[PDB]
């Protein structure tokens, strides 16, 4: 079977006509398990196929030599053999072939090499494979694009260099175009994975967002392919903190709210995290998420989540954003109650809850308290004594977590709003907190002074209380605040002083 060496000779001939006839035969032997091993074992042969494929001008030989290589790349020896004989720079040049055949073999062999051959990734970057691959994303053969995008994911994984190159070639706009144009699951998947890898790169992140990435990925969140949905969600969460200024998000937001009802705990966890970021300082998104029943979806998601802070923390932070600073703010505050969420919210202030979640839970009680109809319910849920306990302990810790100064501000702030109700004031006072509030006026922190003076101001609206505040030596520290640059501190401080008369 020493026919291998004679073909190697023929392939290197001068008369292209025979060089051709030889490529046909090598390719044919390439199909038999026996004939193929002989080819991948003679580096002289494999090196002939490569040079030929790369320099030939006859399409048939360009396709046949390319196919032969595609066959050898099937085995361990075949790959090392193509690599060792400079196959990569060759295959990379072939990506420029104008034939939909030579092209499919080149990208497929490269794929095999990137997947298995050690030293393959660097060689491809070296030959400018990233640039050609990206320029190839304008084709419409979904199988070809699926193979191509996957090479990009392999080459971009954990490689900032390759990513920036992909970014300079307009990789994000082409990848986004794909997610909006095709319906072939495998392609959408391999492409969503290239976006996932690119979405962790702070410079790529903004580019994907501007290309319409948020909306493009939002298109596949209800797809039956669970791996497709998960990959889009992950990428969506990585981009969300950089997409809070985008318009045309109606669809994604609505789908995200529906995804909260999923049984797949990772779907709910991601949807919650993404909604949290997108409703953060964007009243447009806040109103939308509200119009599509987001408060109920979020309250229901918290009830079911239990002590799962991976779900409750984002959910509670999303509820907090939706209950302040937007036309529907008052409705949401009221809606949280109508859907049985007050008890669960108040509960979260207690162990096993950790500080991040407790801090977020305080800010929401504070917002919920803006609506007078939540005043009694929150009280009957035992919120006041607990808010005072957190305050007192955070303050003593301070005078001797995640910044106890913030818990001190949030709890005093929540109690300030809660103090708008008469029965709440009676409770806040019976908890012997006035001396503490008066002490809080000496805080170096301006935000603490405002809420300290504020709660004292609300309590002072009752004669008996205003007198105890005065009797508690509040007049001196209050007067020292009358010249605060903070209109809030100045106003409240003046109000207490006027009320103690």
């Amino acid at each position: 079977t020493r026919a291998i060496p004679e073909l190697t000779k023929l392939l290197n001939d001068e008369d292209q006509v025979v060089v051709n006839k030889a490529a046909v035969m090598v390719h044919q032997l390439s199909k038999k398990e026996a004939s193929r091993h002989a080819i991948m074992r003679s580096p002289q042969m494999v090196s002939a196929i490569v040079r030929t494929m790369q320099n030939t001008n006859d399409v048939e030989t360009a396709r046949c030599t390319a196919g032969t290589l595609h066959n050898l790349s099937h085995h361990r020896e075949g790959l090392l053999a193509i690599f060792k004989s400079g196959g990569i720079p060759a295959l990379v040049k072939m990506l420029g072939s104008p034939v939909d055949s030579v092209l499919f073999y080149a990208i497929t062999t490269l794929h095999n090499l990137l997947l298995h051959q050690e030293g393959a990734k660097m060689a491809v970057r070296l030959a400018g494979g990233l640039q050609k691959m990206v320029a190839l994303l304008n084709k419409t053969n979904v199988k070809f694009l699926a193979i191509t995008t996957d090479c990009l994911q392999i080459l971009a994984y954990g490689n900032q260099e390759s990513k920036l190159i992909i970014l300079a070639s307009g990789g994000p706009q082409a990848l986004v175009n794909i997610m909006r144009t095709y319906t072939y699951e495998k392609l959408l998947w391999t492409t969503s994975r290239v976006l996932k890898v690119l979405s962790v790169c702070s410079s790529n992140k903004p580019a994907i967002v501007e290309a319409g990435g948020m909306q493009a990925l939002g298109l596949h969140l209800t797809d039956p392919s669970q791996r497709l949905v998960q990959n889009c969600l992950w990428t969506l969460r990585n981009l969300s903190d950089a997409a809070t200024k985008q318009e045309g998000m109606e669809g994604l937001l609505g789908t995200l709210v529906q995804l909260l009802g999923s049984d797949d705990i990772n779907v709910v966890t991601c949807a919650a995290g993404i909604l949290s970021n997108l409703t953060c300082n964007n009243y447009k998104n806040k109103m939308m998420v509200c119009q599509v029943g987001g408060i109920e979806a979020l309250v229901r998601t918290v009830l079911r989540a239990g002590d799962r802070e991976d779900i409750t923390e984002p959910a509670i932070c999303a509820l907090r954003h939706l209950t302040s600073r937007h036309q529907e703010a008052e409705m949401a505050q009221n809606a949280v109650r109508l859907h049985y969420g007050l008890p669960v919210v108040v509960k979260l202030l207690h162990p096993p809850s950790h500080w991040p979640l407790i801090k977020a839970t305080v800010g929401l009680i504070r917002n919920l308290a803006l609506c007078p109809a939540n005043h009694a319910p929150l009280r009957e849920q035992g919120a006041i004594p607990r808010l005072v306990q957190l305050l007192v302990r955070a303050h003593q810790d301070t005078q001797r977590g995640v910044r106890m100064e913030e818990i001190v501000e949030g709890c005093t702030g929540a109690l300030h709003i809660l103090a708008r109700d008469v029965h709440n004031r009676i409770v806040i006072r019976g908890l012997n907190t006035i001396p503490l509030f008066v002490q809080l006026l000496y805080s170096p922190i301006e935000n603490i002074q405002r809420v300290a003076a504020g709660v004292l101001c609300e309590l002072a609206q009752d004669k008996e209380a205003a007198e105890a505040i005065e009797a508690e030596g509040a007049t001196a520290p209050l007067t020292e605040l009358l010249h605060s640059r903070n209109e809030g501190v100045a106003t409240y401080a003046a109000a207490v002083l006027f009320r103690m008369s």
Binding site: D241, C317, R320, R366, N367, R420, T491
Partner: protein
């Protein structure tokens, strides 16, 4: 009217201003204070139409959670 030609009128002038801000910020005024504002509607008008402003009770702004290092 004009600022104030006495400690007394300075007090009233300031009290009116503070009660107007307190209310603009979302806090309720006491019955006594509501009466006070009527007794000096004169003073209330002077710094109402000519010296206005806005308000804010307390706050708890929105933070943008970040999610990095995936692939």
């Amino acid at each position: 009217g004009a600022p104030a030609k006495s400690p007394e009128e300075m007090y009233i002038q300031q009290k009116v201003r503070v009660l107007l801000m307190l209310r603009k910020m979302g806090s309720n005024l006491t019955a006594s204070e509501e009466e006070f504002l009527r007794t000096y509607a004169g003073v209330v008008s002077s710094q109402l139409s000519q010296l206005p402003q806005h308000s804010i009770d307390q706050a708890a702004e929105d933070v943008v959670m970040a999610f990095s290092r995936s692939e």
